[PDB]
């Protein structure tokens, strides 16, 4: 168990649970000076919430696939720091698994993830069977499948470009996971900021001062200049 | 060019323990301010504690900044610019990812309001006004220095 996971670098607690002890009893605010006593009521802080970040979101996603194991349900600041140092290793593992999956299923099954309109069986045996009964080899069938792909799907599929190599975990994250990178919706609604690009400013709106009178017409109106 | 170093919001990395340290300094200030109101400490003691607790907190963040980069993000773009000696020093980087610290008013003294935030987080309005003392003085000294 432990001391073998530790030796190999497999996921394990930093401190052995068997060789872990409590911290006894400490001063209980009656044996303490005033400056070291805990406040009776919790104090508002503005730092009372953990700062959202990319590392927290990726670690949770990797914990659900089993690629890593964490001490608890939510990654600690220690675990996000450690992830920052070794994050390129875990991404390389995921990219390698996609390469092996493509080499197993073949291009038809692999790339049908981004061609929703394609309903023919995409297995290797089905591809071979279609070739024998019709004469169309695998490359011909692949070109036919990509003829049913939308431009929106094609742009998503560019994550599999051999020069881009987008993280497979990033490519399949759902919206509710992704938005926790910045911590969800802003409390001040963005609709307050949004303006139509072709809007014409209405100078009689509630945020504008009253129209400026012509100075001469103002002086004549108040009977200080005679025509 | 081929590597194409850049700079994003995510690259402006704050050390993991800033939230713990700022919250601890806030707690000690809050307790002392209460006992100042009770008459248990006098106004000079409150003044010293406010300046010294936040200066030490800021200096500790700056000290821990480089080892955090060296250990957890060695190829961080902000770290590579200053650490290699290409552009920028730790002090300027500390303003981006650490905390701006304490400013001084024109007549020598310090302002009794620490700037807890940095430029990535965004200063509050009161913090921004205080930081204008440093900007105004900084150009005045440089004009005097070259003359």
């Amino acid at each position: 168990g432990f001391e073998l996971d530790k030796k190999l670098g497999r996921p394990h607690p930093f401190i052995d649970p068997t060789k872990k002890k409590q911290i006894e009893t400490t001063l209980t605010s009656d044996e303490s000076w005033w400056n070291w006593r805990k406040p009776e009521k919790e104090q508002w802080s503005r730092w009372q919430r953990r700062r959202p970040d990319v590392e927290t979101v990726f670690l949770k996603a990797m914990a659900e696939t089993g690629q890593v194991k964490l001490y608890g349900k939510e990654p600690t600041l220690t675990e996000t720091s450690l992830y920052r140092a070794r994050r390129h290793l875990f991404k390389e593992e995921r990219l390698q698994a996609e390469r092996e999956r493509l080499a197993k299923e073949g291009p038809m099954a692999f790339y049908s993830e981004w061609v929703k309109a394609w309903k023919r069986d995409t297995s290797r045996e089905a591809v071979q069977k279609h070739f024998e009964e019709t004469g169309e080899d695998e490359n011909t069938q692949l070109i036919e499948m990509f003829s049913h792909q939308t431009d929106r799907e094609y742009r998503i599929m560019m994550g599999t470009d051999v020069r881009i190599k987008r993280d497979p975990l990033a490519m399949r994250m759902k919206e509710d996971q992704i938005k926790q990178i910045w911590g969800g919706d802003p409390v001040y609604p963005t609709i307050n900021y949004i303006q139509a690009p072709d809007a014409v400013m209405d100078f009689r709106g509630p945020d504008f001062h009253e129209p400026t009178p012509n100075m001469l017409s103002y002086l004549k109106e108040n009977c200080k200049v005679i025509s | 060019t081929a590597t194409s170093i850049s700079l994003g919001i995510d690259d402006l990395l704050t050390i993991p323990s800033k939230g713990w340290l700022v919250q601890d300094a806030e707690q000690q200030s809050l307790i002392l301010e209460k006992h100042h109101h009770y008459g248990n400490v006098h106004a000079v003691e409150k003044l010293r504690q406010s300046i010294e607790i936040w200066y030490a907190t800021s200096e500790y963040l700056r000290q821990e900044m480089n080892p955090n980069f060296r250990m957890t993000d060695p190829f961080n773009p902000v770290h590579m610019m200053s650490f290699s000696g290409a552009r920028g020093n730790a002090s300027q980087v500390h303003q981006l990812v650490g905390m701006r610290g304490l400013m001084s008013d024109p007549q020598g003294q310090m302002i009794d309001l620490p700037i807890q935030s940095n430029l990535r987080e965004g200063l509050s309005l009161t913090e921004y006004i205080i930081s204008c003392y440093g900007a105004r003085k900084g150009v005045v000294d440089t004009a005097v220095r070259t003359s």
């Binding site: 030796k7 190999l8 670098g9 497999r10 140092a85 070794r86 390129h88 290793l89 875990f90 593992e93 | 060019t1 590597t3 170093i5 060695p74 190829f75 590579m80 610019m81 290699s84 000696g85 290409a86 552009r87």
Partner: peptide
Amino acid sequence: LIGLYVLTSGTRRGICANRYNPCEPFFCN
């Protein structure tokens, strides 16, 4: 200076190079 630094920053080492504890090409010139 940044270009030289990136150029001569060598390979990743240790726990930054291998996920697990391990218990490369050769060029003639």
